[PDB]
């Protein structure tokens, strides 16, 4: 155990340090909450922190680590926004008590050796053109879960496929953690919070409202059935200047090998210039 000053932000880089402090805290009866992040924190991340904070007796651990294993070449890894000064300041302001900021060397001292192989869901949607992306995500999350051993781990719904795959990891490896999905935080016009929003110029920012407009239109059209919901979303996206749709799919809530019934999830990914944006929404078919 290194030092832990309660009511203050404690930053640990060494996996051993945060593991020691976490273990000590849990033994004195605190419930450890984990919010895994890649930094560049926005209000979406702060909603996760606040949800964690609400759990009685909680101590909140926010990890910040840009994980090289979930990026493919070139390219993307070097381009990910890094603003540690802002991040830690936001955490102090939220009364978070632990930030965990490991090095690449500490996380991957043996490179990529044992890794997590996701189920078939990882090959679809976001995984289609990026066949190793979710192996990278699940490997890092497993490691963070083992280092920190939290009672609960918090993820946004914005990256819905990621959230589902993390629930699969937790179930499939019998991890003793509760996965908490938090509803997507949105700008006033509906745009989903994302660290990628900073790459939209004023015009693209304006056009980008079409993703959330298309989704909310579909959710309401859905009383009239799946075809109507999908066609409403498509119509809104088609009305949008220089939104280039990658996919728009209505799936079961688990995204998996089961047909859509009364409850589903509508997912969209689209490019605005070079910026790729995701959003999704709960859909009830035939329900007003």
Ligand X SMILES: O=C(O)c1cc2ccccc2o1
Shortest CA distance to 181 belongs to which of 166, 201, 200, 199?
Answer: 166
Question: What kind and span of H or E run contains 247?
Answer: strand 244-252
Say how far apart CA 132 and CA 109 lie, in whole Å. 20
Decide whether 38 or 164 has the Cβ nearer to a copy of itself.
164
Shortest CA distance to 123 belongs to which of 256, 259, 263, 275?
Answer: 256
115 binds a copy of itself (CB under 8 A): yes
Binding at 137: pick from a copy of itself, ligand X, ligand BZ3, none (beta carbon under 5-8 Å per type): ligand X
- Residue list 90-129, contact with ligand BZ3 (CB under 6 A): none
- Residue list 170-189, contact with a copy of itself (CB under 8 A): 171-176
Is 5 a known active-site residue?
no
Binding at 115: pick from ligand BZ3, a copy of itself, ligand X, none (beta carbon under 5-8 Å per type): a copy of itself
3-state secondary structure of 155: strand
3-state secondary structure of 177: coil
3-state secondary structure of 280: strand
DSSP structural state of residue 159: S
Please check if 195 is assigned to a binding site: yes
Please check if 69 is assigned to a binding site: no
DSSP structural state of residue 7: T
Binds ligand X (CB under 6 A): choice among 141, 147, 219, 230: 141
Please check if 40 is assigned to a binding site: yes
Shortest CA distance to 97 belongs to which of 3, 10, 2?
Answer: 10
**Which spans of this chain sit near ligand BZ3 (rule: CB under 6 A)?**
44-45, 47-48, 156, 158, 182, 184-185, 192-194
Residues that bind a copy of itself (CB under 8 A): 15, 19, 109-110, 112-120, 135, 138, 142-143, 146-147, 149, 165, 168-169, 171-176
Residue numbers of the site for ligand X (CB under 6 A)? 36-38, 137, 140-141
């Amino acid at each position: 155990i290194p030092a832990f000053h309660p009511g203050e932000l404690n930053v640990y880089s060494a996996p051993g340090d945060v593991a020691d402090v976490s273990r000590a805290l849990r033994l004195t009866g605190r419930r450890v909450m984990l919010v895994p992040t890649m930094g560049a924190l926005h209000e979406g991340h702060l909603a996760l922190v606040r949800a964690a904070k609400r759990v009685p007796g909680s101590v909140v651990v926010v990890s910040i680590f840009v994980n090289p294993m979930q990026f493919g070449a070139g390219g993307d890894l070097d381009a990910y926004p890094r603003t540690p000064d802002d991040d830690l300041a936001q955490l102090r302001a939220e009364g978070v008590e632990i930030a965990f900021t490991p090095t690449t060397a500490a996380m991957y001292p043996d490179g990529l050796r044992t890794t997590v192989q996701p189920g078939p869901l990882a090959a679809e949607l976001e995984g289609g053109p990026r066949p190793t992306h979710f192996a990278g995500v699940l490997t890092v999350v497993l490691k963070l879960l083992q280092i920190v051993r939290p009672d609960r781990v918090f993820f946004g719904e914005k990256d819905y496929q990621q959230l589902v795959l993390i629930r699969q990891l937790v179930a499939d490896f019998n991890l003793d953690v509760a996965v908490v999905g938090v509803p997507t935080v949105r700008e006033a016009d509906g745009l989903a919070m994302s660290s990628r929003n900073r790459y939209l110029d004023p015009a693209q920012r304006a056009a980008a409202v079409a993703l959330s407009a298309a989704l909310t239109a579909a959710a309401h059209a859905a009383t009239a059935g799946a075809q109507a919901a999908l066609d409403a979303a498509r119509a809104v996206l088609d009305a949008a200047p220089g939104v280039a749709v990658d996919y728009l799919e209505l799936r079961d809530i688990g995204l998996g090998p089961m047909p859509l019934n009364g409850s589903g999830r509508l997912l969209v990914a689209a490019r605005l210039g070079t910026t790729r944006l995701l959003d999704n929404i709960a859909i009830e078919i035939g329900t007003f």
